[PDB]
Each structure stands twice: as C-alpha cells, then as structure tokens.
C-alpha cells in the first residue's frame, strides 16, 4: 500500500510513488491511432516515434482534460506500462489545473473508481503542490508548462480562485517562436522533427536577460552572447540573442501577438486581487514551478521587475527551486506521504456512497 503520483500536464505526465524523490516515469501527454504491431492505439514516448503512422492527439489542452477516451488510455499506460502496478491496490493522487471545472474533477473521480478500482483517491491544484514542496503553505505560485501558465495566489494551505490568472501563453509557445526566430536568421526550421530539435536548443542554451535592451545591444556589436548547436546529422548552428529572445516573451507577449500581461504583471494583478492583509505574505513568497520558468536569469528578473510595481517599503522575494521541472509532483509525493493527509483521502466506500460528486467536498 504505497500510494501513487500521476501529475497530468499538457506536455508531459510525471508520475510515481509517494515517497520517491522525484517521478519514475516522464512522458508525453500523447495518444496515437493508426492512420490506414501494428497495435490499436499507442501512448507516449513510443506514439511520438510512431507519429508518421499515427493520428496524435493530445488529451489535455492549456492544462484541462478534454478527451476521457484518450485520458484514460494514459492512466491505463501509467499504471500498466511505466510503473507496474496494479492500480486497483494503492490509493492514487492527481492533479489537476486551478480553476478545473465541477464536472471535470467529477468526471476524474468516477474514472479511477470505476475503470480503474482504486482503494482510494485524491485531486490536488498542482500549483498548490509546488507551493508545499517549496516547504509553506503561503505564497503565489507562477505555474508556466507546455501548455498554460498560472499564476496562484495561496493562504494557509488553500488557493484563492477569484484572484487566479490564466495565460494561454508556455513552452509550446516559445518553441514555436524559437522555430520562427531561427528561421528568420536564416536557417529553416519547420518541421515536426525540427521542432524537437528547437525543443533541445530551448531547453539547452537560452536565458532570461536582466535587461532586454542592455542584452540586444551585447548582441549587436559582439559575438560574446553566440553559441554553436549541433544538429544530429553534424551541422553546427549558430544561436544569437534567440537565446534571451525567445523566453522574453514571458515579460512581452506581444512579441507572439498576444495583448496579455506579461508574468510581472499578472503577478502583481493577482496580489491585488487578494484581501490587503496577505498582500505581503505573497510579495515575499513568489514561487516558481514548471519547466518554462527554468529558464537562467529568470528570477532576478522577476524580482527586478516586481520591485518597480511593488510599493517602495515592500520586502520581495522569488524562490525558484532547481527541482521545479518535478516540483508539482514532489508536492504530491510529500502530501500523500503526509500522516495528517490520511483522513483527507477519499476511499471506494465513500464514493460507492455519494458518487462522484464527493471529489467536491473532500477536495
Ligand atoms: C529534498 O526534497 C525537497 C526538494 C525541494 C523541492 C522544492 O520544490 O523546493 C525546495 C526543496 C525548497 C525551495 C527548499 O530548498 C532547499 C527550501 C525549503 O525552505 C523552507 C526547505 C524545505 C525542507 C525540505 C523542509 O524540511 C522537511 C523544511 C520544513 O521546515 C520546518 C517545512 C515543512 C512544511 C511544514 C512542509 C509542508 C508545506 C508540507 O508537509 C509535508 C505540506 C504537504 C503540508 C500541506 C498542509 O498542511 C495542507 C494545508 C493540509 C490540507 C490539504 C489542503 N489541500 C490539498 C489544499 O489544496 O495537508 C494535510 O513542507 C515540507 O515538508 C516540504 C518538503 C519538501 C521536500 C522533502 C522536497
Ligand atoms: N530547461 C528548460 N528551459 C526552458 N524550458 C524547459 C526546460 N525544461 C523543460 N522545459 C519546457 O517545459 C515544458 C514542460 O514543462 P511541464 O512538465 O511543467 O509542463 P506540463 O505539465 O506538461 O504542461 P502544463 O503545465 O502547461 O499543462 C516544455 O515546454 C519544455 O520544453
Ligand atoms: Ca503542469
Ligand atoms: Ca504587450
């Protein structure tokens, strides 16, 4: 009776056991069907190899599951394929997006107790999670993935709705604009194979500049921000101020075309909207998580940019923890583990009982 982790996000499932470090298993949020083993549908890692067989979907868009046939298939490949387990012995936690909808967290209740027979289960805002592997239970959480970012606004151990914020804006994003920014430099990348290629260069070399103009001059006039990037088949590139470029968005979402706040913005909007009180318990804990907020140089900027709107008296301070690729699921794994988390689980009798609608008063 070790309980399980399975971290849903639109780009990659984490999951594991209650306990561990950090997940067992990291894959993508991908189902494949056959256009014209072969097998009837493939998942993850093996789907994207596949993909030129394959129709892909992608089951959880901007962070919100909207397809429960091919939901369930990544359940079913959690359990069965990555972890080998039988799921019907250990009490499961999920996660899900703030501001997930009433009939959605319904409808993850009813799939674990009646697809999969779980003893037990739980649902959990994953910004909520980050913030307890942080070590509190106070703060807002800037939340960035693949597919959406967050920012979470959080007291004694429970978020606050009315002042979260939703940005349509994350990695996948800043991929695609990568793609287009090297591309305009004078290379060609626009391929679905090129795009994991940029995913790499992303990940890999760029960096949140301190100051964007300082940097864009830098840039300019030396050859000191360049680094080389080789392609798998031995080409090298060469990667300018796409480095800071890209991750800038973030800060100025007009860059992509997008009228919203940029994450400073949206930051100090979300304090606002909280009662005046707990105002500076969030200044002064601002967490980050996921792994668009990876980025080098990310929480200087961050701590630069929320000083110039904050008060002039106000104590500010970004904590960006290294493990906050995986910090939702360690939020998970320590909460599960938790002994006064034990009666907060729901079990097979308590749903048999109220049905899926429990999921609303136990979590
Ligand atoms: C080495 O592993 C750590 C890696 C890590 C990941 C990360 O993202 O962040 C860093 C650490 C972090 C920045 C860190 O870095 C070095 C600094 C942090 O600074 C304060 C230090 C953390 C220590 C690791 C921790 O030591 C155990 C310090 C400790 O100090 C006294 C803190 C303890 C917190 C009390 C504890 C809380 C938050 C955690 O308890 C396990 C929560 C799960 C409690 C949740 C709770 O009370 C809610 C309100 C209640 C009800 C549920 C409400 N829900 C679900 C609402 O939505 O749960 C039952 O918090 C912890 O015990 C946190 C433990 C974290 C780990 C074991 C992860
Ligand atoms: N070192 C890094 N630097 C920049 N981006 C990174 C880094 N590592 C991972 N990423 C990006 O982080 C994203 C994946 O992060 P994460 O697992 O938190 O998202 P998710 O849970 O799948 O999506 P979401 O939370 O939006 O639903 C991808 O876009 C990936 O390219
Ligand atoms: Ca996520
Ligand atoms: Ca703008």
């Known amino acids: 009776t070790t309980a399980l982790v399975c971290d849903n996000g639109s780009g990659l499932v984490k999951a594991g056991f209650a306990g561990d ?9 991908i189902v494949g069907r056959p256009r014209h083993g072969q097998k009837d549908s493939y998942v993850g890692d093996e789907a994207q ?12 868009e901007h962070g919100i599951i909207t397809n429960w046939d091919d939901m369930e298939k990544i359940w079913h490949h959690t359990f069965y394929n990555e972890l080998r387990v039988a799921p019907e012995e250990h009490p499961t936690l999920l996660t899900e997006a703030p501001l997930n909808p009433k009939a959605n967290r319904e409808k993850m209740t009813q799939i674990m107790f009646e697809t999969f027979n779980v003893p037990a289960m739980y649902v959990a805002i994953q910004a909520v999670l980050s913030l307890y592997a942080s070590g509190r239970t106070t703060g807002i959480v800037l939340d960035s993935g693949d597919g959406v970012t967050h920012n979470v606004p959080i007291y004694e151990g429970y978020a606050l709705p009315h002042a979260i914020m939703r940005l349509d804006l994350a990695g996948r994003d800043l991929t695609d604009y ?17 795009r994991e290629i940029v995913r790499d260069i992303k990940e890999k070399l760029c960096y949140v500049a301190l100051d964007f103009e300082n940097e864009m001059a830098t840039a300019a006039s030396s050859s000191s921000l360049e680094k080389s990037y080789e392609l798998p088949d031995g080409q090298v590139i060469t990667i300018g101020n796409e480095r800071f470029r890209c991750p800038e968005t973030l800060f100025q979402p007009s860059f992509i075309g997008m009228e919203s706040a940029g994450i400073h913005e949206t930051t100090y909007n979300s304090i606002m909207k909280c009662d005046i009180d707990i105002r500076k318990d969030l200044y002064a804990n601002n967490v980050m998580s996921g792994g668009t907020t990876m980025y ?3 929480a200087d900027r961050m701590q630069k940019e929320i000083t110039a709107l904050a008060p002039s008296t106000m104590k ?3 904590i960006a923890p290294p493990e906050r690729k995986y910090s939702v699921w360690i939020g998970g794994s320590i909460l599960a583990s938790l002994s006064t988390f034990q009666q907060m689980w729901i079990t097979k009798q308590e749903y048999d009982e109220a049905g899926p609608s429990i999921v609303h008063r136990k979590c």
């Open 21 to 29: 470090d950090a997940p067992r298993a990291v894959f993508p949020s």
């Open 49 to 60: 190899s596949k993909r030129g067989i394959l129709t892909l979907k992608y089951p959880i």
């Open 178 to 194: 990568l793609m287009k920014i090297l591309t305009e430099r004078g290379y060609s990348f626009v391929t679905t194979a090129e």
């Open 296 to 298: 080098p140089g990310i």
């Open 316 to 318: 500010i301070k970004i």
